[PDB]
Amino acid sequence: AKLHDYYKDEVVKKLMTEFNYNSVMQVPRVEKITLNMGVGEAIADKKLLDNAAADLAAISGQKPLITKARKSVAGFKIRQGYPIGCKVTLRGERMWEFFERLITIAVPRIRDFRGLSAKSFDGRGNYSMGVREQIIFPEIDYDKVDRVRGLDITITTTAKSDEEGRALLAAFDFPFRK
Amino acid sequence: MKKDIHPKYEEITASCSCGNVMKIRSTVGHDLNLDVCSKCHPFFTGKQRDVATGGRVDRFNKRFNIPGSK
RNA sequence: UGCCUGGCGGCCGUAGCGCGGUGGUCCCACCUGACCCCAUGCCGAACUCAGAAGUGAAACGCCGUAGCGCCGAUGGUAGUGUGGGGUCUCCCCAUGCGAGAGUAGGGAACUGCCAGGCAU
RNA sequence: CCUCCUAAAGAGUAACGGAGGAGCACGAAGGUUGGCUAAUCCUGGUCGGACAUCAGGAGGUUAGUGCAAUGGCAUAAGCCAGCUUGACUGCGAGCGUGACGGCGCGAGCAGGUGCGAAAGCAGGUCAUAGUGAUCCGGUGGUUCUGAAUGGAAGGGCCAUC
RNA sequence: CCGACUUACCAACCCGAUGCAAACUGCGAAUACCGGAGAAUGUUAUCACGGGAGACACACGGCGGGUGCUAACGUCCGUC
RNA sequence: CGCGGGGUGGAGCAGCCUGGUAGCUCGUCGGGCUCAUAACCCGAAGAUCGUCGGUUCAAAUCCGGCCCCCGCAACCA
RNA sequence: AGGGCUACACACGUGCUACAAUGGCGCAUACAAAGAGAAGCGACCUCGCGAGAGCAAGCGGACCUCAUAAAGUGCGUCGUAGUCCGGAUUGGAGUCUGCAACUCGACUCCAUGAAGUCGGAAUCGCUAGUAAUCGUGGAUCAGAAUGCCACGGUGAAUACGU
Numbered sequence: 001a002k003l004h005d006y007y008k009d010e011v012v013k014k015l016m017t018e019f020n021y022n023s024v025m026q027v028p029r030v031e032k033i034t035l036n037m038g039v040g041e042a043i044a045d046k047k048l049l050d051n052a053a054a055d056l057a058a059i060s061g062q063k064p065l066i067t068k069a070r071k072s073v074a075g076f077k078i079r080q081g082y083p084i085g086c087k088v089t090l091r092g093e094r095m096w097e098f099f100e101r102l103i104t105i106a107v108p109r110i111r112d113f114r115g116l117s118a119k120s121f122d123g124r125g126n127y128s129m130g131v132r133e134q135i136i137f138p139e140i141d142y143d144k145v146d147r148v149r150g151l152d153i154t155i156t157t158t159a160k161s162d163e164e165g166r167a168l169l170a171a172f173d174f175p176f177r178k
Numbered sequence: 179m180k181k182d183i184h185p186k187y188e189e190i191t192a193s194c195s196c197g198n199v200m201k202i203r204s205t206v207g208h209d210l211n212l213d214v215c216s217k218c219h220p221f222f223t224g225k226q227r228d229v230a231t232g233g234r235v236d237r238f239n240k241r242f243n244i245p246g247s248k
Numbered sequence: 249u250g251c252c253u254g255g256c257g258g259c260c261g262u263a264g265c266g267c268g269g270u271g272g273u274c275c276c277a278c279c280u281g282a283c284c285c286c287a288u289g290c291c292g293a294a295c296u297c298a299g300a301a302g303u304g305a306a307a308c309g310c311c312g313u314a315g316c317g318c319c320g321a322u323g324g325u326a327g328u329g330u331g332g333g334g335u336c337u338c339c340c341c342a343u344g345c346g347a348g349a350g351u352a353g354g355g356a357a358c359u360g361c362c363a364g365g366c367a368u
Numbered sequence: 369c370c371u372c373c374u375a376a377a378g379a380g381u382a383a384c385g386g387a388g389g390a391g392c393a394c395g396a397a398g399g400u401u402g403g404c405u406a407a408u409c410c411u412g413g414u415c416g417g418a419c420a421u422c423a424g425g426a427g428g429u430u431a432g433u434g435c436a437a438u439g440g441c442a443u444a445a446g447c448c449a450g451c452u453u454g455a456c457u458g459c460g461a462g463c464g465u466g467a468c469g470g471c472g473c474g475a476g477c478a479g480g481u482g483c484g485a486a487a488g489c490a491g492g493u494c495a496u497a498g499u500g501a502u503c504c505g506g507u508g509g510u511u512c513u514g515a516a517u518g519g520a521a522g523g524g525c526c527a528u529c
Numbered sequence: 530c531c532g533a534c535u536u537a538c539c540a541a542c543c544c545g546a547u548g549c550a551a552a553c554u555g556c557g558a559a560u561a562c563c564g565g566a567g568a569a570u571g572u573u574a575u576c577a578c579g580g581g582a583g584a585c586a587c588a589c590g591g592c593g594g595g596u597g598c599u600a601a602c603g604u605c606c607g608u609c
Numbered sequence: 610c611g612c613g614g615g616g617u618g619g620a621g622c623a624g625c626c627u628g629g630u631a632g633c634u635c636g637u638c639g640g641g642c643u644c645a646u647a648a649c650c651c652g653a654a655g656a657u658c659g660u661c662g663g664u665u666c667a668a669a670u671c672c673g674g675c676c677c678c679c680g681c682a683a684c685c686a
Numbered sequence: 687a688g689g690g691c692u693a694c695a696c697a698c699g700u701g702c703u704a705c706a707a708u709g710g711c712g713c714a715u716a717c718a719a720a721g722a723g724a725a726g727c728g729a730c731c732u733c734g735c736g737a738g739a740g741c742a743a744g745c746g747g748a749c750c751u752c753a754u755a756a757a758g759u760g761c762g763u764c765g766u767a768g769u770c771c772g773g774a775u776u777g778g779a780g781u782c783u784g785c786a787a788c789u790c791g792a793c794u795c796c797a798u799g800a801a802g803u804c805g806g807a808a809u810c811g812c813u814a815g816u817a818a819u820c821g822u823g824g825a826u827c828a829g830a831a832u833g834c835c836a837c838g839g840u841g842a843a844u845a846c847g848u
Binding site: 074 | 629665666667
Binding site: 032037038068072120125127128151 | 425
């Protein structure tokens with residue numbers, strides 16, 4: 001993926017000196033983007049969960065797979081483990097290529113006020129966000145002309161501060177939230 | 179990798195330096211340097227002598243007397 | 249012969265935790281490649297296989313550290329058998345047994361087999 | 369009848385004595401092999417709700433356990449998946465238990481089946497509660513047998529209701 | 530109203546520290562009990578088989594626990 | 610410090626046979642309607658299903674404590 | 687002098703307007719009555735997207751303007767989609783009278799956007815140039831009606847029975 005190739009070739013060599021590490025093994029990276037698509041209440045309908053799995057079947061070559069209620073406060077018919085979302089855990093080439101569709105073809109999906117939130121980083125290397133609509137990646141420029149549903153995001157990184165979170169992949173043309 | 183759709187970049191990254199119906203370089207703000215502020219300060223930022231739509235020039239010599247039509 | 253590292257054990261835990269210093273192209277871990285054997289809820293994350301480079305960050309490990317877990321006297325004390333005395337709610341004495349907690353002091357484990365690195 | 373306490377550190381043990389459970393469930397909630405690991409709180413984001421989820425951190429098992437509760441459980445006795453049906457048949461030294469009928473564990477053998485590379489494991493389910501001895505009534509198998517002889521109602525034996 | 534300009538007002542989570550428990554433990558006796566070895570003493574103890582029981586309504590007291598009232602010349606049990 | 614039944618919106622009553630609020634009817638409220646109101650007619654709202662605690666994804670509904678109402682027990686001699 | 691008569695989770699009497707298609711929209715296009723105007727009405731012409739303003743013939747109205755009155759007629763287009771309908775609400779800007787348009791006026795332009803799918807118990811006007819339905823003018827009036835008074839256009843259905 002060109003975003004990761006640029007990040008290792010140009011950005012990692014500068015983060016080395018901006019944070020003045022002793023080892024090249026200290027420089028931050030994204031580990032995984034784990035996802036959820038936590039639409040909820042879908043056990044009473046099933047077709048909503050099948051439609052959310054059909055959006056995730058188009059974000060990556062990877063297969064959709066259910067997320068479930070754990071505290072399960074709402075209730076329907078079955079105890080505890082009723083489904084709420086359809087996940088797809090992306091890593092490496094399958095997450096770096098997706099972030100490269102953002103602001104190149106997904107331009108109507110991403111706004112300045114919906115950019116990267118610089119205050120949402122933490123020194124544990126954990127991050128999360130919502131995008132309120134589905135964003136697909138086909139073999140060509142295409143959109144399924146269907147809406148209603150949306151997606152939420154979960155990310156793990158090797159960053160040991162929230163300031164190194166603000167430096168990781170920060171050279172790309174994706175906006176920042178303000 | 180139990181692949182269900184195929185990722186390809188050649189149709190979506192070629193000629194992306196410009197803005198068109200198929201792809202755009204960047205979105206609104208950031209790299210596009212868009213401004214989104216609001217302001218007021220009505221009338222007094224301009225010249226205060228402003229006049230309505232009409233057939234005459236500025237500082238004209240006369241005005242037609244409507245009773246003088248007889 | 250001594251020092252250091254690795255796999256596998258002994259003990260049955262003053263064998264630990266926290267903190268600080270600090271080390272590795274011996275080993276080790278991070279780590280590179282995935283395509284093949286093998287594999288995933290999807291996922292080369294995990295498991296598996298072919299393994300380059302760089303490093304000592306994490307993980308790993310040694311040393312310093314008595315802050316914490318913790319070892320812990322002597323003596324008294326509680327409890328308790330028997331005998332005598334004896335209060336209604338249980339108790340005193342002679343005599344045999346006698347803690348737990350605390351104080352002082354201590355504690356940063358000890359050790360075996362086999363292989364690797366290093367030294368005259 | 370089971371568990372904790374009554375119960376007094378070998379052991380047994382009462383009173384309408386204090387608390388809680390049992391009348392069944394499981395063909396997966398069984399065998400076997402490999403691997404995995406929590407309640408809860410904090411952190412982060414929004415269609416995402418409520419206080420609801422994915423991820424990370426702290427917690428370091430509190431959770432989970434077919435069914436209340438104690439004991440026990442990480443080498444898991446908790447949990448997930450492949451193959452599998454030992455939810456074994458004929459037998460059993462020894463130990464534990466009760467007055468006895470009867471009852472719990474079990475060294476170990478032969479047959480036959482299954483897992484695991486193989487060592488190795490498989491007598492159902494973490495163990496204990498889920499009412500039924502004996503006469504008797506029914507039903508399947510049966511050269512074990514059937515009174516003058518041969519068949520036989522019938523009797524016995526085994527299995528089970 | 531997200532938020533905040535405010536103390537006048539409550540409590541233990543959490544935390545420092547004191548107090549406490551049949552159905553809490555982190556610690557943990559004495560006295561027993563039972564296997565093994567052993568002296569002296571005990572008229573056979575311990576135990577198998579056989580003939581025969583009587584007994585199944587036990588009680589004030591000491592020491593321990595329940596219950597009642599930390600009542601009973603009470604009541605259930607452990608124990609002499 | 611016994612036992613059995615009861616505790617529902619303003620008011621009466623159904624329910625539960627272990628659950629997934631709000632039923633039926635009178636009343637109330639606005640509207641049609643009348644000179645006006647009773648009343649017919651149309652439509653809508655209500656509520657800590659005694660209460661606190663327990664079980665559960667979910668409790669008015671199952672279960673324990675407690676408060677309240679009614680009945681039963683409440684001596685033979 | 688300023689404020690209020692105009693406030694606001696309500697209800698009603700009476701009126702307006704829409705939900706469209708024998709309707710809307712863009713273009714072409716036909717046939718009226720009536721009424722006001724001396725610090726007033728007003729074409730041609732000029733300026734502006736436009737309200738309107740400038741310039742200015744005419745006139746006191748059988749002499750002029752509103753004015754191609756609109757519905758209707760010709761042509762393209764929409765297919766029931768909350769629309770090519772409705773356009774409340776709401777942002778911005780311009781025009782107007784007047785001492786002055788903040789609460790609280792009228793007109794114009796751009797943009798935005800909601801209920802509404804022909805509506806309960808029920809109810810009202812009308813017998814023909816009537817109702818239904820389309821447009822116009824005036825009083826009152828600095829300015830300012832969807833009410834009131836008057837006007838002309840298109841123009842029904844049905845009337846057994848009592």
